[model samples]
Target chain A: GSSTMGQVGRQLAIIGDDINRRYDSEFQTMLQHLQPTAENAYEYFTKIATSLFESGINWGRVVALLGFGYRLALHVYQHGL
Target chain B: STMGQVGRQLAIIGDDINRRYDSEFQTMLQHLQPTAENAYEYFTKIATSLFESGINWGRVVALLGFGYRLALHVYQHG
Candidate 1:
């Protein structure tokens, strides 16, 4: 059983890498400007949540999607996507 | 810097939403052991509703951010 390499993880890895590469420049610039500080990161995440909710996205789905993206980005940058 | 702020804000909000959803999913799974298919179906419902509501650019950008983070979180935790 490939317990470690589950479907969700694989999907996330592939999609995360794609997103990062596709929006690399923009994301990189954001990171540069924000400097990835803890306070700033928290604030950034909150802003994303608010926007999604205001836009009529079910608050739950938005949270799930963004949570997945954050994990994937962290994994890729930390361990090479 | 307005654009930058906007971008950052969108990303932050998106992540917050996804994290909440993930937590809810975990609870749902604990209670019902919901299948991935069911979860995806629920996701579609939410997405469609948002689209029909005529979201603004800020919200659109935030949705994108949510997707980006979801991809990342699934990679690490799923």
Candidate 2:
């Protein structure tokens, strides 16, 4: 049986357009000022880690602990850093 | 019927595979710290590189941004 997914397709297109505009504007500015070095990349990723931890921890202590532990484990196994 | 059962099993297997793929993708992104900011920067860098390679800047940026958004949508909804 054929199903109508036209609405889904339309919704996806709308969302894609919105994301594209937002990505282009904000991202182009970031790129213009990007340091493009390993140290800067590491700092950027670490900031993301901190933000994720802050948000997740604010929700619950258990979440905070688990999140930190998971990150640590990944660091140990993957980058050793 | 056997055919109906086979069809149902295939559906279940497909769903399970998709779920696993989603989980792995999420894990990889988390590990890589693939946030919106990171994706945006990556896309912008790609756009710049394409333009430097003789592609039209406006067209390259548009194509890169659209392609990135499409990939992100698939990752989010697939």
Candidate 3:
């Protein structure tokens, strides 16, 4: 697993940076599940993470999930929602 | 340049984790109430626990860096 770090990190940064454009529809839909509260945010994060982990754990999917998490975090912090 | 960029990205990830998990950060602060005398001890406990299974450098950096930023954010905001 020596190179797993490089692969995971590289994809995380690349996909995370472009997530809004690449996953526009999925991005918008996922927001519907987001409620404007800290407990809700934490709960939704764990929920999504567990779903992804259980589904398949594809590398790209994992990166995309984390990318969405980053955007979610940014949205919560910026809007205080 | 590679290491430099990696460091920058890690910092960004750290901030993201802190912002995403603010509830956890708040709960941790409430429970630990880390002060000057015991701050390092708190980190020591976390670091020791992190390596309890095995060493994953990436997870180690992300977690410790997240802790650093969480503490800084609390200090600044509170």
Tens digits of per-residue lDDT for model 1, A2-71: 2222333333334344443444454445455444444355655555445445555644444344443464
Could you say which candidate leads in TM-score?
A: 3
lDDT to native, each model: 0.44, 0.36, 0.47
Report the lDDT of model 3 for residue A15. Answer: 27
Candidate 2 residue spans exceeding 4 A from truth = A56-81, B1-78
How far residue A74's Cα lies from its native spot in candidate 1, in Å, is 6.6
Model 3 segments beyond 4 Å from truth?
Answer: A1-19, A79-81, B1-78
Residue A39 in model 1: lDDT: 37
> Model 2 over residues B1-78: C-alpha lDDT tens digits?
322332233333334333433444334334334344455554444445434434322233234333444366447754
Q: Can you tell me the CAPRI class of model 3?
A: incorrect
By TM-score, rank the candidates, best first: 3, 1, 2
- lDDT at residue B28 of model 3 (Cα atoms): 48
Best by lDDT: 3
| Residues A1-81 of candidate 3: C-alpha lDDT, one tens digit per residue | 222333333322332333334443544455644533455677666666665455343333444455556656766675573
Spell out the clash pairs found in candidate 3.
none
Stretches off by above 4 angstroms in model 1 are: A1-16, A58-81, B1-78
lDDT string for model 2 (A1-81, tens) is 011123222322343343334333433333334322333444544443354444333212222223323333434344323
Q: B1-78, model 1: which lDDT tens digit per residue? A: 433454445555445545534564343334333344354553444345445544433334344544444444444454
